[PDB]
Amino acid sequence: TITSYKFESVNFDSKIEWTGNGLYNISLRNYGIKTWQTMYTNVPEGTYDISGFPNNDFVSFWVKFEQGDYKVDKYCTGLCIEVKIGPPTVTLTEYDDHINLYIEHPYATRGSKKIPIYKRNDMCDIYLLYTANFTFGDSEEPVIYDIDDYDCTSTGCSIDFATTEKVCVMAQGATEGLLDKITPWSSEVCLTPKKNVYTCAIRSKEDVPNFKEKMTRVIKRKFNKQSHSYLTKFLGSTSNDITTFLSMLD
Amino acid sequence: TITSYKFESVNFDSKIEWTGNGLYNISLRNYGIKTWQTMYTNVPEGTYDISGFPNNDFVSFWVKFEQGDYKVDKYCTGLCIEVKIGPPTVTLTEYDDHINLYIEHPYATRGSKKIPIYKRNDMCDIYLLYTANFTFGDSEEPVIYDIDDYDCTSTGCSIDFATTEKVCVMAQGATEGLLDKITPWSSEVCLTPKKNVYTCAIRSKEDVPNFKEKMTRVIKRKFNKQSHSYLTKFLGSTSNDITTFLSMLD
Amino acid sequence: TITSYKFESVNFDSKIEWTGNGLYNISLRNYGIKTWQTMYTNVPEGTYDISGFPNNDFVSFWVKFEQGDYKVDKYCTGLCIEVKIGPPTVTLTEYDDHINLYIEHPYATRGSKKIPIYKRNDMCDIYLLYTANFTFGDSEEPVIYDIDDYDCTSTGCSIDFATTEKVCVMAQGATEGLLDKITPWSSEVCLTPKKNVYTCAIRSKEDVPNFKEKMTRVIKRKFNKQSHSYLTKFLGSTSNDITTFLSMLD
Amino acid sequence: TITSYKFESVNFDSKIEWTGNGLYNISLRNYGIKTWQTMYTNVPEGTYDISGFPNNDFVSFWVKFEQGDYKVDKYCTGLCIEVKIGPPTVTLTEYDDHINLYIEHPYATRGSKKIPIYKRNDMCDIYLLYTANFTFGDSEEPVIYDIDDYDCTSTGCSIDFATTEKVCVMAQGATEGLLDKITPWSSEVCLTPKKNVYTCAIRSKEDVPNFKEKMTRVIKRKFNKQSHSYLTKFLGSTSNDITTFLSMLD
Amino acid sequence: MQDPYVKEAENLKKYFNAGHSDVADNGTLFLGILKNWKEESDRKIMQSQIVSFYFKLFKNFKDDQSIQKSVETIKEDMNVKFFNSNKKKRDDFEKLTNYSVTDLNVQRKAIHELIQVMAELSPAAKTGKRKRS
Amino acid sequence: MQDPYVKEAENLKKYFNAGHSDVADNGTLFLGILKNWKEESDRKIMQSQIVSFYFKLFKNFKDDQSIQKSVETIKEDMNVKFFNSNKKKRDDFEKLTNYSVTDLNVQRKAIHELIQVMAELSPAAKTGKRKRS
Amino acid sequence: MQDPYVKEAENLKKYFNAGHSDVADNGTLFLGILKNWKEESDRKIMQSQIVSFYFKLFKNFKDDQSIQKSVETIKEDMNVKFFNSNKKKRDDFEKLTNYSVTDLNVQRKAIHELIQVMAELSPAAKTGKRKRS
Amino acid sequence: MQDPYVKEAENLKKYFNAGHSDVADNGTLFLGILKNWKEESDRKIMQSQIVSFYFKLFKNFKDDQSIQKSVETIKEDMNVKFFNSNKKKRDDFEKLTNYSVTDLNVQRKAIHELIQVMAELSPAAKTGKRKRS
Numbered sequence A, B, C, D: 001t002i003t004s005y006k007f008e009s010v011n012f013d014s015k016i017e018w019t020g021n022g023l024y025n026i027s028l029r030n031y032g033i034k035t036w037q038t039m040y041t042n043v044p045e046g047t048y049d050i051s052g053f054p055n056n057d058f059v060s061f062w063v064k065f066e067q068g069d070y071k072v073d074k075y076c077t078g079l080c081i082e083v084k085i086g087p088p089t090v091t092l093t094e095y096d097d098h099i100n101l102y103i104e105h106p107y108a109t110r111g112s113k114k115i116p117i118y119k120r121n122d123m124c125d126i127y128l129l130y131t132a133n134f135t136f137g138d139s140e141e142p143v144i145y146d147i148d149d150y151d152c153t154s155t156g157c158s159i160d161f162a163t164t165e166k167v168c169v170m171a172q173g174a175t176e177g178l179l180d181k182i183t184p185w186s187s188e189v190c191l192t193p194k195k196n197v198y199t200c201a202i203r204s205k206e207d208v209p210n211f212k213e214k215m216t217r218v219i220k221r222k223f224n225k226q227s228h229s230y231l232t233k234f235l236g237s238t239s240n241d242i243t244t245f246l247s248m249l250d
Numbered sequence E, F, G, H: 001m002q003d004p005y006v007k008e009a010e011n012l013k014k015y016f017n018a019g020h021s022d023v024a025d026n027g028t029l030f031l032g033i034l035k036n037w038k039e040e041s042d043r044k045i046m047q048s049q050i051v052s053f054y055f056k057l058f059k060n061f062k063d064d065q066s067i068q069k070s071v072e073t074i075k076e077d078m079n080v081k082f083f084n085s086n087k088k089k090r091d092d093f094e095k096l097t098n099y100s101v102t103d104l105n106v107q108r109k110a111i112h113e114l115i116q117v118m119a120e121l122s123p124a125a126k127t128g129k130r131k132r133s
């Protein structure tokens, strides 16, 4: 007789913890599928990994315990609903003209392969919207920065920024929506960059007119009079196009 | 009799300082011009402004002093050679996503009008190459930054940069070349910006591939499948063009 | 008593022709609308224009005739189904380097205004696909040319072409689809162009590589070496883009 | 004793024709070069090819004839001045949507290799400006068409054009300038194309606004509303650029 | 996409005696609604219900032999225009329309699948959320 | 778009006693079908029928007071996600689903409007036909 | 830019008896040098000296009436090709070539203007210096 | 490109006693002319003649030891700015300036090469002629 049972799943690594006397056969049935899938044969109480058996959806699955004629089924609402999502991993890398913040998505481990939990159809299409807490220098007022999903891929999110002082960062993810998954905060990482004048060619959409103004000046000083007008007309069309693309981020 | 004479010119504001008993008529002759230009009539010793009379070139001019039958001419090599250039003016302005350093060129004052000394044919075509000393936070090691002339106009030079800590700056100009003009250091200005994550759309030529990668991702997620391919092809041509323009700064 | 009745509509100019003794009140009811709209009061047999009263849709309308206590309703399936579409109008205009064929859509006359029958929501969204028969010189084998709807606007279709000999053309339209409207052939128009070498900058998508080859040669001969490479890179991106746009016509 | 001598060169195939009794040694000296180059040893009167010996420049060369102690030098002004240029070769090829006229430059034959006479430094930098006489149908008034050098390469000139009737063409070349070379007319070639409606995507610089108008319409009908505006903005910049490139042909 | 479809629709109008001026009473069933929605998605939502209405109506007259050809022709036009001639799409559609709401077993499965259906109405990876609210 | 919706869906699962392992028998009602169609238009066609199924099911239990809050919460999630919170869109939808196929008058109007409906399934000005076949 | 120029150049060759094979001795005066420089600026530097050479040579024979037409035609070709038909450009050029280096006054003016000339050889605003060395 | 060049130019001004106010008489030798031409090609044409003038002037004073360093420094600035430090370019230039117009043999070679020089003033493949006149 099963005296205690608990199902838990973190980043899709599903485990069952139970107590009972003797050995038992453990099997699982997913909603919509007729056959029970045998997971363990004649095993004693303890904690067992059952990753891969429950379907990753919003419908239920049942874990059945059998010992001779004894039989009991344990109901679970649905893995996409029950699964907990661990914290992401943050890395700070220094470059000659900027600092890169890299947020690696929490991942599922299917054997030896690490599968990022980000918009995968086989993992509830779950993806996290990240918030990063930036600590600059010795400030006691961390800056709250919301990561734009456009800066994220299946692997993680990449944010380039610049400052001349020490910076520490930690990030947290949330899915919002139907599944209200909230992750724990990642560990904090710091980095001290070199003192430098950090500049950019095109800072934002509003900076394009300055880019155009400068390049018009460069063309005028760099090339002979004859090529001036032509090159400047192409600069005009390219400037309009850069603006058009940047407007896609509005 | 003229007992002492000295000519001086700072930013083309030319003055003569002299001593002698009695009143004198003061006139000036420029190389290549036959007539003497009367500057002062029956004046006593002292300091007199003669801005505008000497030609701004590399050939000589003579200042003549007359008193009755007495006459003496004072030789000068050429104003472009003798003129001293004063220090520039630096201004630091804070914006939402960056800090602007503005270097105003030393200027000549023709009456009430301020004429910037920068590539003017009427002012020896003189222009300064600037060096700025950046002091970040409480560092004792100032950063040396050479201003690119492409960032300068007839008015001054503009440099946008980003940092989250306090910054102080002073600048100095030099013409190099035939005229070895070196200016005094400007006064130092400081500014404390707000703590923020300072980012950019396109940091440099080497950052274009990242811009292309991101925009490809944005187009794919933002528009329907049908428009995907077309928009992405235009992104490819615009990315090549941005790179081509940025290469002009190589 | 109404002894004969016939409804006809050409380009939405609807008319009823009927016979009967005495005077009658004529009214019309459209499917889905409760009230009868009085069109004529106490009128004798003949042909009457009732344009504007029948709704332009696929559901029925009834024309009611009343004389004292006598009353009779005439059923019609639906104007979009019954309407006949007249022939288009063709015009040939000569230009210095080409001949223009202009096909004006059949139009409805709402009073004094001419409304082109082309993709209008108030006119069944009807639009014709045109076929033109081109007669070149004295050939007895007319060339069949199907007009691309991309060359048509709300007003008509425009086709530019070139030949050095006499050309005559007539066109016919068809809607295909649910409404199988076929128009009569337009009248034939001819034009004799001047003898000339008719050339083009970019003939088609397949001609872009030749355009690029030629322009590369022009840039190389026209500008100095320094501007060569830059201008040629922009030519490369513009050539790719022209191809991309032309591919939209595939 | 040399009793008659004549030098002739067509397309740089230089020959000497002479008469005299006995055998002679024939050598040549070019202005600026000290040594005589032996061309023929102990040969009798006749016509001899001496291609390659005279330098292709504007300075003289001397042909020396020797027989024992007898010696006579024949002066020539300079090959670039004396050389005659043969007629070009014209070819007419039919394509699905146009006719191609190809003018092959007169060529020099250095052994087995055919070297086109077009802007070569080793051949006086000579190049011909071509004029083609087009005969359309049975007209008695040929059309005079001046070939744009931008349509020519080291191999020849290529002109694409369209007409539905028979066309015959012949071409003639002239260098103008210091060397007043005029070639004989080429042989005439004809071609009868198929009857077809010959159209173009972009006819000329003045046709770009029509290209833009049409493509705006295509984009609006082909893609969903969301992508409309973006694609149309890129069309605007590409249209400006096509115009800019075409203006290079002004 | 042809004249035959119109011809058969008219034959049905005659058979059902739906050509009298009084039929026009009480506005319309589908005309006004279809006019209110032009976005493709909204149109499909409404058309799906109109198409199922017609299939059910036709099913209720599968005995009248005289109009069977008319009905078959109309249904084919719908298979072509609404289902894009995709037999699997039509079969799935018909499967959905035949589920019985009074069948106790069907009810349990429907209730059990409710959360997944809700998740399907607003696809997670498809909801353009870029930043945390 | 929240935890409350899941909570109420689960409450309904309990109320309907739809949490037994045998409920999973006979594949699924909607899960497989929704998986077969990813194009937005095809999805709307199927979802429209699934949504009308649920509204009808809920209507058949408007008496059970105990689950009324659960039902009201679910319906609201559907109004938000499927109808985009547009009340007119929902009202038109509900109007379509309530038309009776056995009502003789409704039948005549449906048959009368058939040709216009067919014309609406394949909008003329929207059918990308560029040249004559 | 014509046959007449060639004709007159040849007439001069005859007049100067410069058509004998021994004239070719000792390489060339201008041919090799003009071949060494293709950049427009370098060419102008060399051509300027060659053109002044010819003007001086022609000046030394302004008495021979028989060849005056030949000389005048050659000079005109040079005015057109080298001076671009600009009379002011030709006059300034000729002014420069006539200054005497032995004239004490000319010497003083030349020495006095030396620094400005040096500044003109490397125009300040034209030297593409972008940053401090 | 330095202060030493100015220093030596000034030393020469003193040596030649060219610092008196009366030196300024009669406009200028080179200042006005250099001001009239801004196009690079026109400038080179004029500068070439001014540079040859100075080389000849300096040559006429190769004995005065006291100013030899000044002269050598000036010539070096010219080698750098006008000849771009190219020794071959300077040697060809100097070769041209040394040809004697009175040497009968030089005269014959010059006349003989006249047509080629004329052809070099207006390079055939470089004259942008696109169509027949």
Ligand SMILES: *[C@@H]1O[C@H](CO)[C@@H](O[C@@H]2O[C@H](CO)[C@@H](O[C@@H]3O[C@H](CO)[C@@H](O)[C@H](O)[C@@H]3O)[C@H](O)[C@H]2NC(C)=O)[C@H](O)[C@H]1NC(C)=O
Pocket: A023, A024, A025, A041, A042, A066, A067, A068, A069
């Ligand atoms: C876990 O599942 C296994 C597999 O079903 C169970 O083992 C099976 O147990 C049955 C009943 O004890 C065995 O059947 C017996 O077979 C013998 C031999 O023919 C026959 O004489 C008996 O009358 C009876 O039919 C079956 O052989 C056995 N299968 C094997 C190969 O092990 C096991 O009992 C389950 N464990 C628990 C905790 O319930």
Ligand SMILES: *[C@@H]1O[C@H](CO)[C@@H](O[C@@H]2O[C@H](CO)[C@@H](O[C@@H]3O[C@H](CO)[C@@H](O)[C@H](O)[C@@H]3O)[C@H](O)[C@H]2NC(C)=O)[C@H](O)[C@H]1NC(C)=O
Pocket: B023, B024, B025, B041, B042, B066, B067, B068, B069
């Ligand atoms: C500064 O320059 C002024 C202007 O040249 C000098 O004034 C001029 O001085 C001369 C000689 O003293 C004056 O000439 C005299 O004129 C009177 C009147 O006709 C005549 O009787 C005398 O014989 C003599 O020619 C001249 O008038 C005077 N000009 C004026 C209007 O002031 C002045 O002397 C100079 N100052 C110095 C410090 O040298």
Ligand SMILES: *[C@@H]1O[C@H](CO)[C@@H](O[C@@H]2O[C@H](CO)[C@@H](O[C@@H]3O[C@H](CO)[C@@H](O)[C@H](O)[C@@H]3O)[C@H](O)[C@H]2NC(C)=O)[C@H](O)[C@H]1NC(C)=O
Pocket: C023, C024, C025, C041, C042, C066, C067, C068, C069
């Ligand atoms: C066409 O329609 C008009 C408008 O309805 C018809 O005229 C109307 O005819 C009725 C019956 O003849 C008239 O009613 C009579 O009114 C008088 C005056 O009060 C009353 O004494 C009679 O007992 C009767 O009610 C009505 O006045 C008249 N309307 C007008 C203003 O003309 C007409 O008869 C129809 N024509 C045909 C061909 O049916």
Ligand SMILES: *[C@@H]1O[C@H](CO)[C@@H](O[C@@H]2O[C@H](CO)[C@@H](O[C@@H]3O[C@H](CO)[C@@H](O)[C@H](O)[C@@H]3O)[C@H](O)[C@H]2NC(C)=O)[C@H](O)[C@H]1NC(C)=O
Pocket: D023, D024, D025, D041, D042, D066, D067, D068, D069
């Ligand atoms: C064409 O040129 C050839 C090559 O120079 C001439 O042949 C050479 O003619 C000379 C004089 O007749 C020969 O010189 C003689 O050599 C013999 C042998 O040593 C010597 O005994 C004589 O006293 C005299 O020096 C030379 O050998 C000969 N070269 C060869 C190898 O053929 C030829 O004469 C010229 N032909 C004409 C038409 O002028």
Ligand SMILES: *[C@@H]1O[C@H](CO)[C@@H](O)[C@H](O)[C@H]1NC(C)=O
Pocket: A133, A142, A144, A185
């Ligand atoms: C991030 O900043 C917020 C804003 O006050 C703060 O409450 C929070 O503690 C910070 N992150 C953590 C948990 O360190």
Ligand SMILES: *[C@@H]1O[C@H](CO)[C@@H](O)[C@H](O)[C@H]1NC(C)=O
Pocket: B133, B142, B144, B185
């Ligand atoms: C700028 O930095 C240099 C580098 O050591 C330093 O010597 C200089 O003093 C700084 N500028 C000044 C004069 O403050």
Ligand SMILES: *[C@@H]1O[C@H](CO)[C@@H](O)[C@H](O)[C@H]1NC(C)=O
Pocket: C133, C142, C144, C185
């Ligand atoms: C157009 O060409 C077809 C092809 O044979 C011909 O049958 C038809 O008569 C022509 N158009 C008319 C009716 O003139």
Ligand SMILES: *[C@@H]1O[C@H](CO)[C@@H](O)[C@H](O)[C@H]1NC(C)=O
Pocket: D133, D142, D144, D185
């Ligand atoms: C080309 O046209 C001209 C114009 O009249 C004519 O004189 C000439 O004969 C034609 N070409 C030849 C020679 O056939």
